[PDB]
Amino acid sequence: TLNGGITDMLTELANFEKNVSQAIHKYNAYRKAASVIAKYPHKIKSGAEAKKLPGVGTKIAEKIDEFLATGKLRKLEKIRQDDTSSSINFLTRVSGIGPSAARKFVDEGIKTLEDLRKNEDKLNHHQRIGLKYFGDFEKRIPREEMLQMQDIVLNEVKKVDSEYIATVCGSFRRGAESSGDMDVLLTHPSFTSESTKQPKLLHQVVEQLQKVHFITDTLSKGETKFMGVCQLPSKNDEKEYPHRRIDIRLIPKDQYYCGVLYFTGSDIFNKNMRAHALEKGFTINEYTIRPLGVTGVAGEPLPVDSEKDIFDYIQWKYREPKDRSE
DNA sequence: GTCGG
DNA sequence: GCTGATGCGC
DNA sequence: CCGACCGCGCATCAGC
Ligand SMILES: CC(C)(P(=O)(O)O)P(=O)(O)OP(=O)(O)OC[C@H]1O[C@@H](n2cnc3c(=O)[nH]c(N)nc32)C[C@@H]1O
Ligand SMILES: [Cl-]
Ligand SMILES: [Cl-]
Ligand SMILES: [Cl-]
Ligand SMILES: [Mg+2]
Ligand code: NA
Ligand code: NA
Ligand code: NA
């Protein structure tokens, strides 16, 4: 929050480029600048000082000078007045509605919360649930609640098969005091990069979590990735808890470290680490770290037995999860 | 929008 | 039905 | 300059 004013601006500009402009790289350009500045241990005095950080160029430098002087950005002042941009930004806040669908809904006259609600028929399944829990999904989850959720998920998984290992990742693993949702990495001895000795491994877990009324809805579900909704149980006479988004990723047991690296994030940290990797001649995904041949084709997986091994391959000193929140 | 070759 | 490309999300 | 910008699971559609 040291340069919160500036970081909020950039994030607003990022969201604009992504939602309205559908300009993915401009979106990432702004988020990275915001990330880099949020990490800067000094209260930025000028755009010149900002431009020294990597990710901040000449354009963002001008904007930062304007913000510091007026306390705002004209470009944003106008954007907030443009009804189309405002409508598109709003709609995109519903899970399942992206830049394209948002713009299309607007063309059709579907622009508000009320509109969406009276037009459920025009929404696929995911959007339908996103609208259903529109309010809850914007609420934060206190670490205390994440802890209760962790307990339920681990114990229920333990009941299905004592050999399952569920690891809560995301901002939780990074030590945050509150998370936007719950991310669960899951492994089972039967599922390795070598073979799937048992079917429905993920399905069985989902089923059990639904059986105890923890998982309440499903946005999407496949053999290895579940995207849905969950809710902590409330006590007698106690108001129930908000519904929460939950992601469960089944990953080959032998590829745990690359998997937990991926799922721990942050997303920008991942983007930065993978980029640095390429420069170092390696390619990283949630399954493996491979070398880049002369041509450019990925080689065979390199041996990995800890997250640190991955860091070593790219010549980066290890960074604990708590320090990966970029 | 920013960066590196 | 399939594969491949596009949305959307992590 | 100007090309690259991480990598992938699932839902959905076009074309066959
Ligand atoms: C701060 C959070 C948004 P929250 O607390 O508000 O939930 P989070 O938990 O950090 O991220 P979230 O739940 O969206 O995705 C989980 C992880 O998936 C990885 N991940 C997400 N997006 C990407 C991406 O674009 N690329 C890669 N490689 N990994 C990603 C890194 C992410 O950490
Ligand atoms: Cl772009
Ligand atoms: Cl691994
Ligand atoms: Cl791979
Ligand atoms: Mg999360
Ligand atoms: Na810079
Ligand atoms: Na959305
Ligand atoms: Na998530």
Coordinates of C-alpha atoms (C1' of nucleotides) and ligand atoms in Angstrom, one line a residue:
Chain A
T1 CA 0.0 0.0 0.0
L2 CA 3.1 2.2 -0.1
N3 CA 2.3 3.2 -3.7
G4 CA -1.3 2.0 -3.7
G5 CA -2.5 5.0 -5.5
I6 CA -0.3 4.2 -8.5
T7 CA -0.7 0.4 -8.3
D8 CA -4.5 0.8 -8.3
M9 CA -4.3 3.0 -11.4
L10 CA -2.2 0.6 -13.4
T11 CA -4.5 -2.3 -12.4
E12 CA -7.5 -0.3 -13.6
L13 CA -5.7 0.3 -16.9
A14 CA -4.8 -3.4 -17.1
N15 CA -8.4 -4.5 -16.6
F16 CA -9.4 -2.0 -19.2
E17 CA -7.0 -3.3 -21.8
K18 CA -8.1 -6.9 -21.1
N19 CA -11.8 -6.5 -20.7
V20 CA -12.7 -3.7 -23.2
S21 CA -9.7 -3.5 -25.5
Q22 CA -9.1 -7.3 -25.6
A23 CA -5.4 -6.4 -25.7
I24 CA -3.8 -9.2 -23.7
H25 CA -0.2 -7.9 -23.8
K26 CA -1.1 -4.4 -22.8
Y27 CA -3.0 -6.1 -19.9
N28 CA 0.1 -7.9 -18.8
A29 CA 2.3 -4.9 -19.4
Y30 CA 0.2 -3.0 -16.8
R31 CA 0.0 -5.8 -14.3
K32 CA 3.7 -6.4 -14.3
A33 CA 4.4 -2.7 -13.8
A34 CA 1.9 -2.7 -10.9
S35 CA 3.6 -5.8 -9.5
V36 CA 7.1 -4.3 -9.8
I37 CA 6.0 -1.1 -8.2
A38 CA 4.0 -2.7 -5.4
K39 CA 7.3 -4.4 -4.4
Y40 CA 9.3 -1.1 -4.6
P41 CA 10.2 -0.2 -0.9
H42 CA 10.1 3.5 -1.6
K43 CA 7.2 6.0 -2.0
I44 CA 7.6 6.9 -5.7
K45 CA 8.3 10.6 -6.1
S46 CA 8.4 10.8 -9.9
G47 CA 7.8 8.9 -13.1
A48 CA 11.6 9.1 -13.7
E49 CA 12.2 7.1 -10.5
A50 CA 9.5 4.6 -11.6
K51 CA 10.9 4.2 -15.1
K52 CA 14.1 2.7 -13.5
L53 CA 12.2 -0.4 -12.4
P54 CA 11.9 -3.1 -15.1
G55 CA 8.5 -3.2 -16.6
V56 CA 7.9 0.5 -16.3
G57 CA 8.4 2.3 -19.6
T58 CA 8.0 5.8 -21.0
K59 CA 4.2 5.7 -21.2
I60 CA 3.6 4.4 -17.7
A61 CA 6.2 7.0 -16.6
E62 CA 4.1 9.8 -18.0
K63 CA 1.0 8.4 -16.4
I64 CA 2.7 8.2 -13.0
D65 CA 3.7 11.8 -13.3
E66 CA 0.1 12.8 -14.1
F67 CA -1.2 10.8 -11.2
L68 CA 1.3 12.3 -8.7
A69 CA 0.4 15.8 -9.8
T70 CA -3.5 15.7 -10.2
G71 CA -4.2 12.6 -8.1
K72 CA -5.8 11.0 -11.0
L73 CA -5.6 10.0 -14.7
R74 CA -7.6 11.7 -17.4
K75 CA -7.6 8.6 -19.6
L76 CA -9.3 6.7 -16.7
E77 CA -11.7 9.5 -15.9
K78 CA -13.1 9.2 -19.4
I79 CA -13.1 5.4 -19.5
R80 CA -15.3 5.4 -16.3
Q81 CA -17.8 7.7 -18.1
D82 CA -18.0 5.6 -21.2
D83 CA -21.1 3.5 -20.6
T84 CA -20.0 0.7 -22.9
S85 CA -16.6 0.3 -21.2
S86 CA -18.4 0.4 -17.8
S87 CA -20.9 -2.2 -18.9
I88 CA -18.3 -4.5 -20.3
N89 CA -16.1 -4.1 -17.2
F90 CA -19.1 -5.0 -14.9
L91 CA -20.3 -8.0 -16.9
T92 CA -16.7 -9.5 -16.9
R93 CA -16.9 -9.6 -13.2
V94 CA -19.3 -12.6 -13.4
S95 CA -17.4 -15.9 -13.5
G96 CA -17.7 -17.3 -16.9
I97 CA -18.3 -14.1 -18.8
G98 CA -15.1 -12.9 -20.6
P99 CA -14.4 -9.9 -22.8
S100 CA -16.1 -11.5 -25.8
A101 CA -19.3 -12.6 -24.1
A102 CA -19.5 -9.3 -22.2
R103 CA -19.3 -7.2 -25.4
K104 CA -21.9 -9.5 -27.0
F105 CA -24.3 -9.2 -24.1
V106 CA -24.0 -5.4 -24.3
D107 CA -24.8 -5.5 -28.0
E108 CA -28.0 -7.4 -27.0
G109 CA -28.9 -4.9 -24.4
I110 CA -27.9 -7.2 -21.5
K111 CA -25.9 -4.8 -19.4
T112 CA -26.8 -5.0 -15.7
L113 CA -27.2 -7.4 -12.9
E114 CA -31.0 -7.3 -13.3
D115 CA -30.7 -8.0 -17.0
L116 CA -28.5 -11.0 -16.5
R117 CA -30.9 -12.4 -13.9
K118 CA -33.9 -12.2 -16.1
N119 CA -31.9 -13.7 -19.0
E120 CA -30.5 -16.9 -17.4
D121 CA -31.6 -18.7 -20.5
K122 CA -28.9 -16.9 -22.5
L123 CA -26.1 -18.1 -20.2
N124 CA -24.1 -21.4 -20.3
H125 CA -23.7 -23.4 -17.1
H126 CA -20.6 -21.6 -15.8
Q127 CA -22.1 -18.1 -16.3
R128 CA -25.3 -19.3 -14.6
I129 CA -23.4 -20.2 -11.4
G130 CA -21.2 -17.2 -11.6
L131 CA -24.3 -15.0 -11.6
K132 CA -25.9 -17.1 -8.9
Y133 CA -23.0 -16.4 -6.5
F134 CA -22.0 -13.1 -7.9
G135 CA -22.0 -11.5 -4.5
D136 CA -20.2 -14.2 -2.6
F137 CA -17.5 -14.6 -5.2
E138 CA -16.3 -11.1 -4.6
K139 CA -15.9 -11.7 -0.8
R140 CA -12.5 -12.5 0.6
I141 CA -11.8 -15.7 2.6
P142 CA -10.1 -15.2 6.0
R143 CA -7.2 -17.6 6.6
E144 CA -9.2 -18.9 9.6
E145 CA -11.9 -20.1 7.3
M146 CA -9.3 -21.5 4.8
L147 CA -8.0 -23.5 7.8
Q148 CA -11.5 -25.0 8.5
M149 CA -11.9 -25.7 4.8
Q150 CA -8.5 -27.3 4.6
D151 CA -9.4 -29.6 7.4
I152 CA -12.6 -30.7 5.9
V153 CA -11.1 -31.3 2.5
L154 CA -8.1 -33.3 3.8
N155 CA -10.1 -35.5 6.2
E156 CA -12.8 -36.2 3.5
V157 CA -10.1 -37.1 1.0
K158 CA -8.4 -39.3 3.7
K159 CA -11.7 -41.1 4.0
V160 CA -11.9 -41.9 0.3
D161 CA -8.4 -43.3 0.1
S162 CA -5.7 -42.9 2.8
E163 CA -3.2 -42.7 -0.1
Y164 CA -4.4 -39.4 -1.5
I165 CA -2.4 -36.3 -0.6
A166 CA -4.2 -33.0 -0.8
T167 CA -2.1 -29.8 -0.6
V168 CA -3.7 -26.4 -0.3
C169 CA -1.8 -24.0 -2.6
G170 CA -2.5 -20.6 -4.1
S171 CA -2.2 -17.5 -1.8
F172 CA -2.8 -19.8 1.2
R173 CA 0.4 -21.8 0.7
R174 CA 2.1 -18.3 0.1
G175 CA 0.9 -17.5 3.7
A176 CA -1.7 -14.8 2.9
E177 CA -4.0 -13.8 5.7
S178 CA -7.0 -14.0 3.3
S179 CA -7.5 -15.7 -0.1
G180 CA -9.8 -15.1 -3.0
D181 CA -10.5 -18.8 -3.3
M182 CA -9.3 -22.3 -2.4
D183 CA -6.8 -24.1 -4.6
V184 CA -6.2 -27.8 -4.0
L185 CA -3.4 -29.9 -5.5
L186 CA -4.2 -33.6 -5.4
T187 CA -2.1 -36.7 -6.0
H188 CA -2.6 -40.5 -5.7
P189 CA 0.0 -43.3 -6.1
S190 CA -2.2 -44.8 -8.9
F191 CA -1.8 -41.7 -11.1
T192 CA 1.8 -41.1 -12.3
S193 CA 3.3 -39.7 -15.5
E194 CA 3.8 -43.4 -16.4
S195 CA 0.1 -44.5 -16.2
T196 CA -3.3 -44.1 -14.7
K197 CA -3.8 -47.3 -12.8
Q198 CA -7.2 -46.2 -11.5
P199 CA -10.0 -44.3 -13.1
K200 CA -12.2 -41.6 -11.6
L201 CA -9.6 -40.6 -9.0
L202 CA -10.7 -37.0 -9.1
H203 CA -14.4 -37.8 -9.5
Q204 CA -14.3 -39.9 -6.3
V205 CA -13.0 -37.0 -4.4
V206 CA -15.5 -34.5 -5.8
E207 CA -18.3 -37.0 -5.2
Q208 CA -17.4 -37.3 -1.5
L209 CA -17.1 -33.6 -1.0
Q210 CA -20.5 -33.2 -2.5
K211 CA -21.9 -36.0 -0.4
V212 CA -21.0 -34.0 2.8
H213 CA -22.4 -30.9 1.2
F214 CA -19.0 -29.1 1.0
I215 CA -19.0 -28.8 -2.8
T216 CA -22.3 -27.2 -3.8
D217 CA -21.9 -26.5 -7.5
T218 CA -19.7 -27.4 -10.5
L219 CA -18.5 -24.9 -13.1
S220 CA -16.5 -27.4 -15.1
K221 CA -15.1 -30.9 -14.4
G222 CA -12.6 -33.2 -16.2
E223 CA -10.3 -36.1 -15.5
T224 CA -7.7 -33.9 -13.9
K225 CA -9.2 -30.5 -13.1
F226 CA -12.3 -29.6 -11.1
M227 CA -13.6 -26.0 -11.0
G228 CA -16.6 -25.5 -8.7
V229 CA -18.2 -24.0 -5.6
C230 CA -18.0 -24.9 -1.9
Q231 CA -19.3 -23.7 1.5
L232 CA -18.3 -24.3 5.1
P233 CA -21.1 -25.8 7.2
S234 CA -22.7 -23.4 9.7
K235 CA -23.8 -24.1 13.2
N236 CA -27.4 -23.9 14.6
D237 CA -29.0 -20.4 14.3
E238 CA -25.7 -19.2 12.8
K239 CA -25.9 -17.3 9.5
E240 CA -24.3 -19.5 6.8
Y241 CA -21.0 -18.8 5.3
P242 CA -20.6 -17.3 1.8
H243 CA -20.2 -19.7 -1.0
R244 CA -16.6 -20.0 -2.2
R245 CA -14.8 -20.9 -5.5
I246 CA -12.8 -24.1 -5.3
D247 CA -10.2 -25.5 -7.8
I248 CA -8.9 -29.0 -7.5
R249 CA -6.0 -30.1 -9.7
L250 CA -5.1 -33.8 -10.0
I251 CA -1.4 -34.1 -10.9
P252 CA 0.9 -37.1 -11.5
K253 CA 2.4 -38.1 -8.2
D254 CA 5.9 -38.2 -9.6
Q255 CA 5.5 -34.7 -10.9
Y256 CA 4.4 -33.2 -7.5
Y257 CA 7.2 -30.5 -7.3
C258 CA 6.5 -29.0 -10.7
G259 CA 2.8 -29.2 -9.9
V260 CA 3.0 -27.6 -6.4
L261 CA 5.4 -24.9 -7.9
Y262 CA 2.7 -24.1 -10.5
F263 CA -0.3 -24.1 -8.2
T264 CA 1.5 -22.1 -5.5
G265 CA 2.0 -19.1 -7.9
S266 CA 1.5 -16.3 -8.0
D267 CA 0.4 -16.2 -11.6
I268 CA 2.8 -13.3 -12.4
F269 CA 5.5 -15.1 -10.4
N270 CA 4.9 -18.1 -12.6
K271 CA 5.0 -16.0 -15.8
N272 CA 8.2 -14.4 -14.7
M273 CA 9.9 -17.7 -13.7
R274 CA 8.9 -19.4 -16.9
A275 CA 10.2 -16.5 -18.9
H276 CA 13.5 -16.5 -17.1
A277 CA 13.6 -20.2 -17.7
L278 CA 13.3 -19.8 -21.5
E279 CA 16.2 -17.3 -21.4
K280 CA 18.2 -19.9 -19.5
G281 CA 17.3 -22.4 -22.2
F282 CA 14.6 -24.3 -20.3
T283 CA 10.8 -24.7 -20.5
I284 CA 8.6 -25.1 -17.4
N285 CA 5.0 -26.3 -17.1
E286 CA 3.1 -27.9 -14.2
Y287 CA 4.5 -31.3 -15.0
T288 CA 8.2 -30.9 -15.8
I289 CA 11.2 -28.7 -16.6
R290 CA 12.8 -29.5 -19.9
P291 CA 15.8 -28.1 -21.8
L292 CA 15.5 -26.2 -25.1
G293 CA 17.4 -27.8 -28.0
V294 CA 19.3 -25.7 -30.6
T295 CA 16.2 -25.9 -32.8
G296 CA 13.8 -25.0 -30.0
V297 CA 12.1 -28.3 -29.4
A298 CA 11.7 -29.4 -25.8
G299 CA 13.9 -32.1 -24.6
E300 CA 13.2 -34.9 -22.1
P301 CA 12.2 -34.1 -18.5
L302 CA 15.0 -33.3 -16.1
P303 CA 15.2 -35.1 -12.8
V304 CA 13.4 -33.1 -10.0
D305 CA 13.2 -34.0 -6.3
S306 CA 12.2 -30.7 -4.7
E307 CA 11.0 -27.2 -5.8
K308 CA 14.5 -25.9 -5.2
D309 CA 15.9 -28.3 -7.9
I310 CA 13.7 -26.3 -10.4
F311 CA 15.1 -23.0 -9.2
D312 CA 18.7 -24.4 -9.5
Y313 CA 18.2 -25.3 -13.1
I314 CA 17.5 -21.7 -14.0
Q315 CA 20.1 -20.2 -11.7
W316 CA 17.7 -18.6 -9.3
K317 CA 18.3 -18.7 -5.5
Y318 CA 15.4 -20.5 -3.9
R319 CA 12.4 -18.4 -3.0
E320 CA 10.0 -19.5 -0.2
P321 CA 6.3 -19.5 -1.1
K322 CA 5.7 -16.5 1.0
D323 CA 8.1 -14.5 -1.2
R324 CA 6.4 -15.5 -4.5
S325 CA 3.4 -13.1 -4.3
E326 CA 4.1 -11.0 -7.3
Chain B
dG1 C1' 3.2 -1.3 -23.3
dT2 C1' 7.9 -2.7 -22.5
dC3 C1' 11.8 -5.0 -23.5
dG4 C1' 16.1 -7.2 -25.9
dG5 C1' 18.7 -8.4 -29.8
Chain C
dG1 C1' -18.4 -38.8 -34.0
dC2 C1' -13.0 -36.6 -34.7
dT3 C1' -9.9 -32.6 -34.6
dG4 C1' -8.6 -27.8 -34.3
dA5 C1' -9.5 -23.2 -33.0
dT6 C1' -11.6 -19.8 -29.7
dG7 C1' -13.2 -18.4 -24.7
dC8 C1' -12.4 -18.5 -20.4
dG9 C1' -10.1 -19.7 -16.5
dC10 C1' -6.1 -21.4 -13.3
Chain D
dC1 C1' 13.4 -1.1 -35.6
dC2 C1' 10.4 -5.3 -34.4
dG3 C1' 9.2 -9.7 -32.7
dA4 C1' 8.1 -11.9 -28.4
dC5 C1' 5.2 -11.7 -24.5
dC6 C1' 4.1 -19.0 -19.9
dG7 C1' 1.8 -22.9 -20.5
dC8 C1' -2.3 -25.6 -20.2
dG9 C1' -7.5 -27.9 -18.7
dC10 C1' -12.2 -27.7 -19.9
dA11 C1' -16.4 -26.1 -22.6
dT12 C1' -17.9 -25.0 -26.9
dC13 C1' -18.1 -24.4 -31.7
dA14 C1' -16.9 -24.9 -36.9
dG15 C1' -15.8 -28.0 -40.4
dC16 C1' -15.6 -32.6 -41.9
Ligands
LIG1 C1 -4.1 -14.6 -5.3 C2 -5.0 -15.6 -5.9 C3 -5.6 -15.0 -7.3 P1 -6.5 -15.8 -4.8 O1 -6.0 -16.0 -3.4 O2 -7.3 -14.6 -4.9 O3 -7.1 -17.1 -5.3 P2 -4.1 -17.2 -6.3 O4 -4.6 -18.2 -5.4 O5 -2.7 -16.8 -6.3 O6 -4.4 -17.6 -7.8 P3 -5.5 -18.4 -8.4 O7 -6.4 -18.9 -7.3 O8 -6.1 -17.6 -9.5 O9 -4.8 -19.6 -9.1 C4 -4.1 -20.6 -8.3 C5 -2.6 -20.6 -8.8 O10 -2.6 -21.1 -10.2 C6 -1.4 -20.5 -10.8 N1 -1.9 -19.7 -12.0 C7 -3.0 -18.9 -12.0 N2 -3.1 -18.3 -13.2 C8 -1.9 -18.7 -13.9 C9 -1.5 -18.3 -15.2 O11 -1.9 -17.5 -15.9 N3 -0.3 -19.0 -15.5 C10 0.3 -20.0 -14.7 N4 1.4 -20.6 -15.2 N5 -0.1 -20.3 -13.5 C11 -1.2 -19.6 -13.1 C12 -0.7 -19.6 -9.8 C13 -1.9 -19.3 -8.8 O12 -1.4 -18.9 -7.5
CL2 CL -2.0 -6.5 -27.0
CL3 CL 8.4 -32.8 -10.3
CL4 CL 5.5 -32.2 -20.0
MG5 MG -6.6 -19.1 -5.4
NA6 NA 12.0 0.6 -17.0
NA7 NA -15.5 -13.1 -15.8
NA8 NA -8.2 -20.6 -7.9

